[PDB]
Amino acid sequence: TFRRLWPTIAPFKAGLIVAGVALILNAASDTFMLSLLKPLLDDGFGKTDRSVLVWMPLVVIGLMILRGITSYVSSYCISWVSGKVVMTMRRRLFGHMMGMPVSFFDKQSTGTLLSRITYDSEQVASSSSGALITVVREGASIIGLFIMMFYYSWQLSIILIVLAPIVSIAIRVVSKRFRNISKNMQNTMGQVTTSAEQMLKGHKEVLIFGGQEVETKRFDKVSNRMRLQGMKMVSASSISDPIIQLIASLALAFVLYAASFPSVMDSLTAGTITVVFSSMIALMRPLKSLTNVNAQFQRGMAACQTLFTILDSEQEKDEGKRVIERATGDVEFRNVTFTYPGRDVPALRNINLKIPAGKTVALVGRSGSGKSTIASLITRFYDIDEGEILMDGHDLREYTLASLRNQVALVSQNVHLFNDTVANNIAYARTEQYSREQIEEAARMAYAMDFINKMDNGLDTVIGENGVLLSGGQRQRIAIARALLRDSPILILDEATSALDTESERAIQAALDELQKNRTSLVIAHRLSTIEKADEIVVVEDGVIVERGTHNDLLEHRGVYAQLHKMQF
């Protein structure tokens, strides 16, 4: 289409302008080179003993140096422009992405999203740059070649432009007719191939009926028909080439017949003919390329449109306007039915689960569904499909998103550690608020001080990718230390690390005890020790509150907790 984007290009108008001149001169750096033929072939050889011939190599060297300089400067400046445009574009896109809700990150577009960030964006920038250079350099080449043509031949140029389009249309029509014939006969080829296919698949019958000889005979006939069809097809193509070659040669012969001696022509001869011919042969390239530019510009902006489909999709709406420094009130699900976006089946029915302050609630459903989403619900990553989760007398959707997300600290077994220094990761975007000594104290009370200790730079080492590549349990420890630093009232534990880590599983247990010593302690506790530690275990088989109460009572009445308990054994 006609896009927009003129802002986000406006400041770098200077760099583009350089190409606008540089590329233009590039055309001259070729056109004059072509023009250099006329001084040579007319007056720079055996006709003259020695003259223009001795200096011409210097002229060619200088012209090619000019071409190289123009190419380099044009490439650098068109780069600069494209790089700046893509710079601003990627920064805006990623800024909107980070605010974009998890609904967009429904795992449907995870792979495509990095593509949009880098590959598709670079593709659009490069396509637009290619379009600009192909409409500037090649466009100016056309104009220069025509100007030189007229400056050299007064009448012959009109002959060439009168004859070239007629020749092109004749070649196109003959090629179209012969390609249509070729495909029409390719259909017969396919029919005979199907005959052979039906020949083969009957082997089961052929062998049992002992008719291999008649099969051989009819295959002889069918193969002969195949050979005849291939004959005719190859003949069609082999006559297609000579006809176009002949029409081109007839065009050239007509041109050379215009070299007759009326007053119209033949006063410009010798090298002039050579330069016009070479100019036309070279013009063959710009003319062919320019018509292709339409298929390029769209090929770029279409992607932009596609990219725009990703830029302004459903966005995160912080409709809530209530801010709380701390959430001392108990967490209470109330008649909350959750529908997972992109999934018709409701992952949760209405539930009135209440999480008292400073109490441990364990959601330990073995169903493997709904339980994970329950952890997200308190954080409002998704949206409450139905019902209300009330917080100190106020619904979650009523609260400001930033404050609520602050109220909750998330720790799991797949904590995606950020590529930064270890100290910063302890308080991301808040390390300015927290003192370094506070980070060290949190790490020590996090029962994970050793990992920083034996690390060479301690609280100054880059830790993420291209860092140290610590184990999953180490990520658990760093995340729990981060939580201790944040001291958020709301706590969610995945506990997914059901495996027993060597020398750290006990450390992890002690650290989780420190984490849950106070503050709300909703946990997804698969481990039996965490289950018994929980004050009010509320296990859900992804539908409803199937069982609830203390673990011993849950064992008393079988329900579903009995099977889960015996599975844990």
Place this chain on the structure above:
Amino acid sequence: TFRRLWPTIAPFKAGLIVAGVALILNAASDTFMLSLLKPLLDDGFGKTDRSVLVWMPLVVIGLMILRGITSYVSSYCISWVSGKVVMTMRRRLFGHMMGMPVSFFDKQSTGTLLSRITYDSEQVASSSSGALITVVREGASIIGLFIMMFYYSWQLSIILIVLAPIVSIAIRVVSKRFRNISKNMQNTMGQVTTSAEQMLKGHKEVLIFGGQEVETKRFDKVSNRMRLQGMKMVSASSISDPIIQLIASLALAFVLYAASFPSVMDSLTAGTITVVFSSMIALMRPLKSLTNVNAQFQRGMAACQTLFTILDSEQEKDEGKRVIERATGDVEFRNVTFTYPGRDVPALRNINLKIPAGKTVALVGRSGSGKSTIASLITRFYDIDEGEILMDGHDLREYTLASLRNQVALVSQNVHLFNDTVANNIAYARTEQYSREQIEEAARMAYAMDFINKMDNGLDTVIGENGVLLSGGQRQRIAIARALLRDSPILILDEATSALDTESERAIQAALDELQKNRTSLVIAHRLSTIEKADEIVVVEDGVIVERGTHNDLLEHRGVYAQLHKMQF
């Protein structure tokens, strides 16, 4: 370089010869055509007279007509050998394919077999033809242009052909160095892309901690480094072009200096330089084609090796010495444990089932495992992995295969209706053995006479694919007529349809009665009526002899016949 084809390409050598001769001119045409340039640009346009100018178009037209006719004739004739080799290889493949055991049709090759027959054999022939047409045309052009050059310039030919290869090596070395730089820098840029991928992948933890600001900042940094890497990459890729262009232009400048500085040169005049330059400009292509010639040769001839592997493999083993007209004595597989080739699990376990003369036995199974292959065992489609199949006290493995195939007739809902006429299908490959009248008599006694009756040409109607396209039940009716005309003693019937076609199922039951009125009948049966009809229903669930006896007796002993009757209802 195997060239086992040469015995199979000798009978057409003559045509190939006229391909080469006609191809040599297809090169010489250009050599003379470019030579025509010298008259044009030396004693042509410039001079007042048109002596060589008016005929110029006539010579071009005549010479290009010669070029076109040579191209057409040479390509058509090389395609003649190509076709008559591709077709003979195809025919040989098919001939040794019909004799191949069903093992080759293990479904290891179902559609790749058709690909071999047409696509791969074509590739063989077309690649060999291209090798010839590009090591004759192209080499002929090479030698022609070289001799033309050396004729026109005593020394310039050397001073140019000695620059061509040094220039080529310089271009290649600089290109390789810049490509290595480009790939290394692209690796760095990809590393930065992985950093950005980590950046975006952490959206969950980015949002929960309310730190999108620091995320945006570090994204600014990483993306700025991205843009620097992209700028450097584009700079390197672009500056690659000027260096090669400049080295080429420097070589050309040296070439021109070769005429300029010395006095031994400078007799070249004007046209001769254009002749030589165009000679090399064209020759740049034939050298590339010749370099690729051997690549194409060994790209295509390996297809011939594969084709020979298809050809040169064990034809269906015919290690049988016993011929019998009719096997009235009971065929029985005793202590036979069959293994489906390519399937480790035996589908048959040492079953000692005897098929009594005249009396009908039935094999019945839900999954069909083993049961389906029980019938196949009788025809020796597969081979005797264990045990012996003794018909009239004589082993099938001992019997000549053709006689055994005659002994047993296969009838099923799915039958390959040969792509021929109705009568020939009724007696495939033995229509000579069975006279025409008995064909329609057997159709009438088959109770499926109507279809032959109402057919367009009746008994002579083409019935194959790309033809009438009867239904599956109709094909089964044609098969029943097939077997009835054959009157074979052994009858294996799939009964896979187990469905009532309108007006055709009762007819099929009657035809089954007629076929099984006498003759041994091993029937894979699902119909309850067929089950009760069989004297001994030895139903096997792939275990072995799972259960046997009359349907009433099978009911008495529930075994598997209880669930079998459940399925029947």
